[PDB]
Design a protein around this ligand. Structure first.
Ligand SMILES: CN1C(N)=N[C@](C)(c2cc(NC(=O)c3ccc(F)cn3)ccc2F)CS1(=O)=O
Length: 379
């Protein structure tokens, strides 16, 4: 099958600011779990104990196909940790391909700041590469296992629509999910989904920064992050320009730092005072680039769970980083994104579900002439 996969359309669910999850089954007979789709990590890890925030959890004792690996894995992040016991079991995706694979599963037995109180998911599906798997690259990621064990083509694509929805098309592309053409950027290295940004424009105005800065020390595509995250020096310049572009209204310093929210009376958000953001990405051809353009609809996130206000409150979802640029849900919700593993490239097209007003629309445009794009990468 190619170009059309109706069975996989709308197979993603979520809640605002809590991410996008797919239904999966593990073990025999099959146990159903909701699993966060994460292109920014490479472990398949699931709740395996009755943590009070969990709707449900993997019960290894009930599975005839479970195999213990007799190894543990401890995984700390910046603000959260999990620890688990490694095994393999049979895994399938009910609204995905008609297959069942034997995959590595980390059965989570202790965690902190990992499961979200009030969320509807019980595990994470790391879709990135073995190089960043925990404990090490010998632990084969789920997608690698899927590709090895079946005839599913080595590609998946994501349409994230900002409760939220979307599509994860496994092993192909569904042409109804986008308009215009796909444009492809090389995956620089197979660890995270690493790409190179060669130029940044706010409202069409170049930031005029050494492009090496845009990728200090990394730029990645990550469905498991909400924000567009930028290196501080780039974030500094970006806000500076966004501040200027939006000067007809004035907002507090903390707002731009995500230390407080800003609110407006319902239906009266000044979208138009806010500038578009354009990232030019390295193209497929020497000296050729393309640009993807997002709206304030993307970087101004509605905050729903705010009991002390009755208005429309938003978070500024652009933030600074020490680990490089992260193109999170803020970017991806604008686009249909094709993770073309077989070809080591990521395609972007205008998403058929992206949220936009009648004056501006997210865009994917090319080709553009950009020299010295190699020098944009950090070593
Ligand atoms: C950035 N990170 C990432 N991509 N993957 C991890 C596994 C992760 C992701 C989430 N992601 C989310 O909860 C989330 C929330 C809203 C979104 F739009 C997208 N993702 C939660 C826990 C966790 F360990 C670790 S992380 O360092 O935090």
């Amino acid at each position: 099958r190619r170009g059309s996969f109706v069975e996989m359309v709308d197979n993603l669910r979520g809640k605002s600011g809590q991410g996008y999850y797919v239904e999966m089954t593990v073990g025999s007979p099959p146990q159903t779990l909701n699993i966060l789709v994460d292109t920014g990590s490479s472990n398949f890890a699931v709740g395996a104990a009755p943590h009070p925030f969990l709707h449900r959890y993997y019960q290894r004792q009930l599975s005839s196909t479970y195999r213990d690996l007799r190894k543990g894995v401890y995984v700390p992040y910046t603000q959260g940790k999990w620890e688990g016991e490694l095994g393999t079991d049979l895994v399938s995706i009910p609204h995905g391909p008609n297959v069942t694979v034997r995959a590595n599963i980390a059965a989570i037995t202790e965690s902190d700041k990992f499961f979200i109180n009030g969320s509807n998911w019980e595990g994470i599906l790391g879709l990135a590469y073995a190089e960043i798997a925990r404990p090490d690259d010998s632990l084969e990621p789920f997608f690698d296992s899927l590709v090895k064990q079946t005839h599913v083509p080595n590609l998946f694509s994501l349409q994230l629509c900002g409760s939220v929805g979307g599509s994860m098309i496994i092993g192909g592309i569904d042409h109804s999910l986008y308009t215009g053409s796909l444009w492809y950027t090389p995956i620089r290295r197979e660890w995270y989904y690493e790409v190179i940004i060669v130029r940044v424009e706010i409202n069409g105005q170049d930031l005029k920064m050494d492009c090496k800065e845009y990728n200090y020390d990394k730029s990645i595509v990550d469905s498991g992050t909400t924000n567009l995250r930028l290196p501080k020096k780039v974030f500094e310049a970006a806000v500076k320009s966004i501040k200027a572009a939006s000067s007809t209204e004035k907002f507090p310093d903390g707002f731009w730092l995500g230390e407080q929210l800003v609110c407006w009376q319902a239906g009266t958000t000044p979208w138009n005072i806010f500038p578009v953001i354009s990232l030019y990405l390295m193209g497929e051809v020497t000296n050729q680039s393309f640009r993807i353009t997002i709206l304030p609809q993307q970087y101004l996130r509605p905050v729903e769970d705010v009991a002390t206000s009755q208005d429309d409150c938003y978070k500024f979802a652009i933030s600074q980083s020490s680990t490089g640029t992260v193109m999170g849900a803020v970017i991806m919700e604008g686009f249909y994104v094709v993770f073309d593993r077989a070809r080591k490239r990521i395609g972007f097209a205008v998403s058929a579900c992206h949220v936009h007003d009648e004056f501006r629309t997210a865009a994917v445009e090319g080709p553009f002439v950009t020299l010295d794009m190699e020098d944009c990468g950090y070593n």
